[model samples]
Target: MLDPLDILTNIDDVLPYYQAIFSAEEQKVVGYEVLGRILADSEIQSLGPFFLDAGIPEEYKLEVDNRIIRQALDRFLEADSDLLIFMNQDANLLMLDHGESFLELLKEYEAKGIELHRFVLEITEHNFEGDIEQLYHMLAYYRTYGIKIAVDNIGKESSNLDRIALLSPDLLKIDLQALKSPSYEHVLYSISLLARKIGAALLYEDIEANFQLQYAWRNGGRYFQGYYLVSPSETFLERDVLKQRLKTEFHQFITHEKKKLETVYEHSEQFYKRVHQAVTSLRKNNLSSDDDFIKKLAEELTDCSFRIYMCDEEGDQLTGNVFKQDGEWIYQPEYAEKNWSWRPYFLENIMRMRNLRKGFFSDLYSDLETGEMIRTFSYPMDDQMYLFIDLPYSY
Candidate 1:
């Protein structure tokens, strides 16, 4: 690493380049993230460590950052492409009096025929030590000039959800490297929800494996950046380089999902047939309301059914909950008369059953009481009543 002073002396030699940010689905270059690369003759590979070091004066760091941005703008003009350009600005640099110089430079570039809308300023929450409101205002001001904001590396210890809410950035960049840990799923899911709420496009970075790429795609990432896709280079790559591969992978994913759905529908149809036969037998003998007949039906459904009950059209419980416990069917009379209208989509499914006059199977979800993944299969018992059965993970 080079000292802060060294950067100033050799500032002209410090090269500002870019790594491509791509759209995984489009398999095309959507933009480029500006990165600095020190020349070999400068005897330094990076100045990032020096900039982050506490001992360095703030003024020197600001000057270096300003210089880099100036160089980056010049390079971008020379390239003359309409692709989006991403630039990073440290929170400390934004606090300096001369911090606004970069904003002025953006205006200068705009006057020179470059589009301000093509720029996206990337900021990290971890190093942001300034006033949150001030940062928000600055970003807002940038938007007036048509420059967008991107919140970067928004997972793990550095994440500040409140800050993200305040920023309401145009883009949210998540580091795919963090997803290797099993515990990161929930965090990523939260971020994904937040991004959707704010209408921010998701961009996943550092994806080095096929699984990482798929994870990003499945989780609603619209843009992708990583070494596996393409390493940063001096020249831009052909946008369609990965088109065929992405098309093939996407097709495979769709095919697999369709097959899984088909299996679920097939199992549901089989279950419906068995339940229909049981209902027919009970009705023929006029024993549908008998406890013995209910228990016998439960035994036949032991392969998938965990709990069974009957409810009226208004969601009033018509019978006790017949739950399987320890290989034996147990009736909980206390559960009678409980209203299930509060359950999600309960009324909607009931209406569907009434109109269709057939059983309705719910999408897989976590059971509130059992904390296990399960699905509910509901069938119309008669004109005024319906039978509900719970199928646990074993199904």
Candidate 2:
């Protein structure tokens, strides 16, 4: 294995597929610690998101720490009344170092009507190795003071779901690596589900491109941070420009996704009609073999990019998952096809079929296979026969 320093110096070698950092004439590298050190503040506008380090070196803590924090707060408050101030604290500071001084500083900021609600305290490490009860106590105390807490660097070292549940913070930030993974899409969905269960807002960090931006938005992340949206500056004057740029990019992404959704909806309707017609014709012919009929129907529907399933009176479920790749169709059996007649999603469709007597559409819900939202349509051909269709489009 290569040395850690070697990896750091040769980042491009290891991260060949990562997005290139965009450099503009007006923007210069800003310094930050813990991640990167170069604070960017815009004199023309308020700081976008003022990130402050709570774990300054002990010697420098008293000399420049409070001063810098106060400067960031003052600049943010003076420039933009609505600016969000993010303070990333070394977990050790709160868990082991007994952050009395930091707590006092937070108190002072809250007393000044700076809106502790706007002050976000991000815990960068989950397993700080301190008193668990005390940690929760501290977090609860901070929340009571209107300071919202967030679990940062999720899916990284020393992070886990149990730790987050113990802390019960207001936000859980998805790690940069987790957001960029093509294979780890399920992890993202799991985090979203946990966040929903706990009533915490989901935040997507390190969003530096169009793909990450849309992924965060479509996956239910409301708060976003990263260079694709805005870079750190020495002053806070360029927020309006940043906001406008993000809005424009987001609008274009949404439009593209909406168009795709419309096309998917159209294809879904056609597929449903075809399956309904096939099932109706087969029933009129007195087809005795349910499996044979569904198999053929699945083959025909594969041309339109869909999977079809049917359940029989014997509680046996038959599925046809037809996937197209390079102009060829492949069929796979659905694993969730045992005594699946009483499944909630299936039963709900039964209700719809009873009323509509035609193919029915499901709402946008996460697919168990891909973790992307899909709509499945189902119709009844006879009392004991059901036809199902799967739509594989996500917005």
Candidate 3:
């Protein structure tokens, strides 16, 4: 396995180049993204009471809590800082043994004029086990007091989106670790799309710069933080001074990013146009009802990365799954084309088609093939018949 330390070193080396481009006004380290760092005495003084009451661990949890509070207070005190404070808290901290009483602990900061509105309190997704309803209620109460909550480390786990939708946080913070794998981009894009639909702000935290920053920005992130933007300084400086330094050095970064996006849009448009044309041509030929035409249609569609199939409302299975074998089109290895009947999930969908007459799209559901959540599109072909198309997209 690759050493984690080596990864950090590589990222740190490339980060400076990315940070050099931001406007001075947007360059300051507004707050800290505390992970393994120790807490400054200032942090201990500012948030110690709440940490004690919340039952947060002293070794790691307390330090993180303290550093975030200290960073928030330090920025608030600076006349030139416009950086938003982002706090990374362990899930358990919010689900403390004391529960609701622990949530009430936030009142101390509210009383101290900490400007909860400026703070984005981020909690990691995928692990909290307390009552979700109570969690929602607590978060709602915090928002009522001007304390904005954030769901952090999105795209790192399976149920993150479900949790985010349930919690309804003010901000969604995704970390860079989730971007290491190429497959993660699709997952990130899907989350960004969902976030836009819900009116929630998307923030890319721990971003190191260049491609990733531009990628995150294009995906609907409004706020960004990482070493590439600005290193955590002992003191916050004037925004204008920092903006001057960043302009000349990082200008190429932005220019390159813009050109890259333009190129991508051109290709994306071409791909979509081709898909529409293919679908249209297939329909115009009256392939919708002919078994041979439908089989050929599936064969063509399956040439891409997805598996394609067709079925009827009576749970009647198709001849075969559109698949490729030795560069030739063939049905899936499992069921012969037009032979086997139906599976339980397919049977359930057939029942749904009995009532709905038009094309219907199912909510994301688990795939029998890979056990990953997928979305299906079904079209009613006759009074008792429906055609189904499914795609695996569990990223």
Candidate 4:
């Protein structure tokens, strides 16, 4: 590893490289991230990790950052493209040391007729010790110039959530490499929801595989960056080179999803027909008791259902739970007369079934009692009654 002082002393050898950030939907290059590539005699090419390491002296790191920013801006001054430029800066360095100089540089660029809004400063290294109020004010001042902020490398650090909340960035960058493990799926999902809640666009970084790109597309990512699309280069990509390819892949995804949906619809239709036939047969026999009828229905649906009950139009349960256990039908009276209207979308589904006079299956959700993922199949038994069957995980 090269010392920061040595790197700064040879600043003339440092050059700025750019990687394209693309809009996943449009498959167009929306912006470029400025990466400092050092052309030293040794093998080390990137200076980012060297500057961010704790072993680095703070003053040296700050100087390297300032030099890189100046170089990137100098290039932008000569470049003709209108795409946004993203540059990395440490939060602690900005808040504690070189903030005034950084602001002056922005004003200098503005004087050069370069729009400040075209810049996005990505804040990294959230675990550093700093004054929260000062950092917030510094970022706010930068935003006043129309420059945007992006929270970068979010999953790599434990304290990134607090930084994201404090800064309220315009963009959130999730590391695709961090999501390589199955354990991080829930974390990625939570971050996606958080980005939406904060009105921040999600940008997945380091997407080296097609599967990673697909994950980014499915997880609410509006922007994507990585080697899979285009590797960092000395010059910006002038066009969306992968637009047609992305469109074809996305089309195939949509087509596959539509087929799955159609299959579900057909299966639902068959399920409804079976349920309707069973209910009509019970009505014709004039079943004297609701308990016997529910027990028989549970037996009939043993292949697909684990629990069955009846409720009135007002959402009051009129029959006990006839649940299956150990291949035998078991009746539980404790579930009787319970009001289910408080459950989410229960009443809306009830109204829909009543209006359509047809049965429907619910989206998969966790069962409150068993904590197993399951779905509920509901049908209107009559004008005053409705029947619900809880499908087990196997279904």
Candidate 5:
């Protein structure tokens, strides 16, 4: 409903609208995302489409966009400017001149008591066609000043997860751009682990509903923002606006989370004893055929376990899987000697078994072969072989 020329015409009338980004740890405003708005004689309108329109030029966009931050920084420079401010910079434009102009502007405010660390630079990967190395250098240059880096609009054309992992930021913001597609949700889950591996904080934005907020909280999102918490306004919100509500909801989250854990823990306890007894009953170290040993254990675990196998400390399968299908057990000998070092926790399981000298339950995961949610009972079978029992979803 607005034109780019009209925006450029009324450049001085443009202003910034900041929406609070809340933290899960303390339920407070950790930062705010600055958005663009403009005042016209008609009414106030969002500058979202004006900036994102392909027909509009960057120079004009930059000229108008620069004011968004300058004025935002002006507001932030006030006495209560202790919190962080999230600023957006176009990735392609940032490398236009090595981001010196942007850096220079922040430095202009730096002398005015606006510390750079209070700033979080958000770079949306708008097809960063420039040399990644040059862009990385510019990002590194900003990092030297203690400014945090965040990347959103992820998994787009060329700027994929590999670039994201290589250019690891201080925070990874997950935008629910596709909430309906299951693959998108799974990708978010994987990115959550990716964020953990890189030691970056996970942030979920645009969380519109209660379930969205709960999903963010459960998936290790330390910071969140959406209409569910609060929406964008001309004025900033008091940090503790939703403190009591968040505490009660998080309490419920913990209480229900522990109920599932308690049930799993109690089941694991009984399963552990059963596994120990089954191992004690069989002498695998002296026996040559682990095939028969697994078959015997499978019989003992028919009610709970759907599959049984053995692996060495290196996770190389020494015996084939004793699998149950249609209430009957069968052995797949071709699976013997298959290496499973591809698993994420490959060595950690071995290390834990050595340290504890007992079997442990693996975290719940989908079975690659069966495509069902399951957990494996991993045991040190006489040091040379490790017995694995794959328990089904119900158990």
Candidate 6:
């Protein structure tokens, strides 16, 4: 790392490194993020540390950032590509001028044939020391010129959903730095979901390998970046550099993903066939009450399900549970009248069961009663009742 004082003296040495951002739709370079660097020792040194130092005043760092910005802009103007240009704005520093100077710099370029819409101002607010309200005010001000804003590090560490609506940023830069762990992988979906809800786009960054690339693509990565695709270059790459390669990789992703989906349906198909036949063969008009018929149904499914019960279309339990425990089946009456309508997809699944008139398996959920992972298969019983069989993870 180069020292800030030395960097200030050699400020003319600062340059911008362009890292291309690719997309799944076009499978090509959609944009480029401008990174700071300095040429020295017949080698390259990053200005990243210089601009990020807290002890140094924002005044000194702004000169370097501003120089790089101008150099990057001049390069973009010369490159003559219409690709989206990503520029990082320290939310703290941007608020320093109420965004006057940045917009002033852009104002000169609009006449130079580089429109504002092509620019994506990437901002990080997690460490800002300014009043956030003023930041949004300036964001809104700059946005009037069609400049887009991207909030960084979403789904990597911590993020705020309410603030997602606050700026309603145009793009979300998801940090995939921790992609090696399967534990944090699930949270990315929630980020994607929130992004969709707020009409925002997603960009996954820092993807270092093929698996992380697929992981991002599978989890709603419309736009992608990282060393796996391309490293920062002094100039832009051919937009179609990864076109055919992405197509082939995506073909495998589609095929592998398709197989898992079909496998779920296959499980549902086999389970449905087994239960449908069992119910038809064993159920008779002369059968006893709902409880008795449910017990007989549980017996037929002893190898598949650990618990069975019945519910009405309204999702109110019509019968208690006949559950397997310790090699014995026991009846629990406490579950009777329990309302499942409050649960997500409970009523929707019931509605589908009524119209479809077929048994369906639900996505895996952790059961509150046993704290075990399981999936429930709901089948239409005679009249208004529905039979639910909870399959435990042991299978």
lDDT of each structure? 0.78, 0.60, 0.55, 0.81, 0.84, 0.85
Worst 10 residues of 6 by lDDT: 155-164
RMSD of each: 3.0, 9.3, 10.6, 2.9, 3.0, 1.7
Off by over 4 Å in 5: 180-186, 278-290, 311-320, 334-347, 381-385
Displacement of the residue 345 alpha carbon in candidate 2, Å: 3.1
lDDT of 3 by residue, 1-395 (tens): 22333323333221101121122235434444432222232231122233334443434444344444554454455533344555556566666643354345455554655555766677766666776676677678767867777886675555556767988777787777455544566777787888888878777867776677766766776666667677655444444545544554446656876786676556445544544455557766655444565466566556442445556545555545654445565556455335224444566666655664434445556667667666665554544655555645533
Which regions of candidate 6 fall more than 4 Å away from where they truly are? Answer: 155-158, 181-183
- State the local distance difference test value for candidate 3: 0.55
Stretches > 4 Å off in candidate 2: 1-64, 97-99, 177-181, 289-292, 295-309, 312-338, 341-344, 360-377, 389-395
lDDT of model 2, residue 312? 59
TM-score, every prediction: 0.87, 0.69, 0.52, 0.88, 0.88, 0.96
Q: Which of the predicted structures, 5 or 6, would earn the higher lDDT when compared with the native?
A: 6
- Model 5 pairs in collision: none
Model 3 clash tally, residue pairs: 9
Q: What would the per-residue lDDT of candidate 4 be over residues 230-328, giving only the tens digit for each residue?
A: 998877666677788888877876787689789878878999999998888877776878778888887777788988999998899998998887778
Instruction: Summarize candidate 5's per-residue lDDT along 1-395 as a digit string, tens digits.
Output: 78888888889899999899988889888879999999987688899898778788779889988889889998988837678989877888778888888889989999988899988988875467788777877888899999899988776556577777777689888876456254455676777888888988988888887777777877788998888888889888788888888888888888887997898888777878988987787773565687988898888888998999888888889999899999999889999979998888977888888888877788878888889888888888665677888987774
lDDT of 4: 0.81
Model 2 worst lDDT window (10 residues) = 14-23
Error in Å for residue 378 of model 3: 19
Clash pairs, model 3 backbone? 19-228, 20-250, 21-250, 24-242, 24-243, 318-338, 319-337, 319-338, 320-337
Residue-pair clashes per candidate? 0, 20, 9, 0, 0, 0
lDDT score, residue 205, model 3?
Answer: 64
lDDT of 6 by residue, 1-395 (tens): 56777788887777899999998998988889999989876778888777777899888888788899889888888765577999988887888778888898999988887889999999886756677777878899888999999998753344566655698898998877776644465678777888898878889989999998988988889999999989998988888999999999999999999998998898898889999998988886567788888788888888878999898888889899999998689999999989889999988988899899899888777899889789999898778888899998644
Clash pairs, model 1 backbone:
none
Candidate 5, residue 288: the lDDT equals 64
Using TM-score as the measure, name the better of candidate 3 and candidate 5. 5
Worst 10 residues of 1 by lDDT: 286-295
Could you tell me how far off, in angstroms, the CA of residue 231 lies in candidate 2 after the best superposition? 1.9
